[PDB]
Ligand SMILES: Cc1cc2nc3c(=O)[nH]c(=O)nc-3n(C[C@H](O)[C@H](O)[C@H](O)COP(=O)(O)OP(=O)(O)OC[C@H]3O[C@@H](n4cnc5c(N)ncnc54)[C@H](O)[C@@H]3O)c2cc1C
């Protein structure tokens with residue numbers, strides 16, 4: 001199930017951070033954190049939503065600018081990778097993967 | 103044991119008073135801080151099951167932070183949702199106002 005949908009929700013998350021302002025106002029930061037909660041609510045997976053929340057409360061969003069936000073999603077994604085014993089990618093590989101979007 | 107019959111009231115009081123002292127003309131910054139505070143409030147709950155229910159409720163019921171009364175109602179409704187899940191009494195809005203009247207200096 002999530003084998004198919006996981007990659008799509010991840011792309012939705014990473015692109016969101018990518019299209020986030022580099023000079024955000026508090027209104028944008030507020031809409032960003034609400035978007036994240038909404039993103040978590042969308043995940044069609046019980047265990048995923050539970051882990052996602054524990055991560056979020058323990059690791060506050062970093063929204064001073066776009067790449068700050070990107071980094072945050074990158075670390076979150078790698079934390080899940082680590083838990084599922086998947087490859088933990090480097091920052092340079094992250095940038096290559098999303099180079100066209102960035 | 104979680105001993106929620108003792109700790110439960112303490113947490114509800116912290117939640118309702120936070121909404122009560124929230125500004126009537128909050129800035130976007132205060133709204134942002136309110137959301138982080140709610141997330142930290144849920145994390146502090148002394149029971150796993152309590153955290154999951156609260157988390158589930160939050161994502162399905164976005165915080166209403168236009169002003170203090172709106173935030174107060176959000177906490178009030180959330181509190182009644184837990185009352186219902188525990189088959190406890192569902193108090194009325196006016197009863198809520200009587201209960202916290204001495205702090206609602208609006
Ligand atoms: C928020 C969220 C939480 C999830 N939680 C769980 C869970 O707890 N348990 C469970 O079984 N499944 C979970 N999933 C699913 C899981 O993370 C995968 O999406 C899935 O199992 C399919 O694996 P995958 O190999 O295609 O890679 P991903 O779906 O992990 O792969 C996405 C693709 O993104 C890239 N990528 C890899 N690492 C990163 C990174 N750090 N930053 C940016 N891009 C990266 C690569 O190009 C890769 O092919 C979750 C999905 C989301 C979106």
Ligand SMILES: Cc1cc2nc3c(=O)[nH]c(=O)nc-3n(C[C@H](O)[C@H](O)[C@H](O)COP(=O)(O)OP(=O)(O)OC[C@H]3O[C@@H](n4cnc5c(N)ncnc54)[C@H](O)[C@@H]3O)c2cc1C
Pocket residue numbers: 106107108109110111112113114115118147151152153155156177178179180181182184185188191193198201
């Ligand atoms: C987020 C959260 C989740 C919880 N989840 C669980 C759980 O999953 N399982 C479990 O066993 N316990 C749980 N508890 C505990 C539980 O809600 C009670 O606190 C507890 O059972 C004690 O009940 P009580 O009768 O003293 O009244 P509480 O519900 O503790 O009462 C606080 C008091 O506030 C008033 N009040 C009642 N309803 C409302 C309202 N809607 N708005 C404002 N005030 C009201 C009355 O003065 C009342 O005596 C949770 C607590 C919190 C804070």
